[PDB]
Amino acid sequence: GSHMRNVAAEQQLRELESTFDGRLGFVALDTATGARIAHRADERFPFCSTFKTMLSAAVLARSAGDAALLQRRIPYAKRDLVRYSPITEKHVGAGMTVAELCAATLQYSDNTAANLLIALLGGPQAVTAYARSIGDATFRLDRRETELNTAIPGDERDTTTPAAMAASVRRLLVGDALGTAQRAQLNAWMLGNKTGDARIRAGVPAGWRVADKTGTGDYGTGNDIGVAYPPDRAPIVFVVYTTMRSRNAQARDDVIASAARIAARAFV
């Protein structure tokens, strides 16, 4: 790629934002060169379910010094369920293993699974602490599911910036924040995501493998973060955050795919 292609990409991202009643936060980092395509990279956005990557990384980091942690079964009752728990709703009572909860929260965005893992780690503050430990000074998890998706304008609870999240995703999925086995497992879970077919995956070349985690919330908040693995190039980190001015707004898969498409064309 080149500086001029990246500049043009950034202009195209500004044009894309002008098509909807909201704002676009975007970073694509080419790990071949360290080059970045950015749009509103240092504005805070509500992360919604994209935090589940940070959450699962924290669990994996803990498992590195306690292999049997991943097999621990966590019980829970129906009364502990929250909205959007398609996997955990099927296993109330005896519950599920820690590994199963990670797969559920990453691949189906299961909310109760996330709450159980947040509890296991020591609460929302423990997830923020993990982020701090990997060099992320920006990420903050303040609430649990599903309140963390309120996406209220000016509310800094449960937010990060596209730049901070891209740096963290790079460290976790490509770099050395996790041990080899743990990085492989985090990638494996995210490669098998079921909720992201219309987002980053829809915008980048079909030949690229994508490990992603989506987020959707109030104010039409529509997010997707992850890494694309081209067959002939180094990995590219993608972070796409969008949110809208109206409470009646809905997330826009197409805008997220379009943003990724614009950047993919520049990193040649």
Author numbering: 22 to 238, 240 to 252, 254 to 291
Sentences from the paper on this structure:
In class A β-lactamases, a conserved structural element called the omega loop5 constitutes a wall at the active site that shapes the binding cavity. PenL (NCBI reference sequence: YP_439646.1) is highly conserved in pathogenic Burkholderia species, including Burkholderia pseudomallei, Burkholderia mallei, and Burkholderia cenocepacia. PenL has been used as a model in exploring various evolutionary paths to substrate spectrum extension through amino acid substitutions, deletions, and duplications. In this study, we demonstrate the extensive perturbation-absorbing capacity of the omega loop against TR mutations of various sizes, some of which are large enough to include the entire omega loop.
Similar to other class A β-lactamases, the active site cavity of PenL-WT can be depicted as a tetrahedral organization, where one plane is open for the substrates, while the other three are composed of the omega loop (residues 161–179), structures including the β3 strand (residues 230–240), and the 102–107 loop and the neighboring 130–132 bend. These three planes meet at the center, where the N-terminal end of the α2 helix, containing the catalytic Ser70, is located. Consistently, the key residues in the active site of PenL-WT were superimposed closely with those in SHV-1, TEM-1, and CTX-M-9. In addition to these common features, PenL-WT showed two unique features in the active site compared to the homologs: an interaction between Arg104 and Thr167 and an increased number of water molecules in the active site. The interaction between Arg104 and Thr167 through a hydrogen bond (2.46 Å) tightened the binding cavity by linking the loop of amino acids 102–107 to the omega loop. Intriguingly, other class A β-lactamases such as SHV-1, TEM-1, and CTX-M-9 do not have such an interaction. The active site of PenL-WT had a fifth water molecule, W5, while class A β-lactamases normally have three to four water molecules, including the catalytic water W1, which has a role in the deacylation reaction of the substrate. All of these water molecules participate in the extensive hydrogen-bond networks that indirectly connect the key active site residues Ser70, Asn132, Glu166, Asn170, and Thr237, which are gathered from all sides of the active site, appropriately positioning them for the catalytic activity. While PenL-WT exhibited catalytic activities (kcat and kcat/Km) with nitrocefin, cefotaxime, penicillin G, and amoxicillin, PenL-tTRs exhibited loss of such activity.
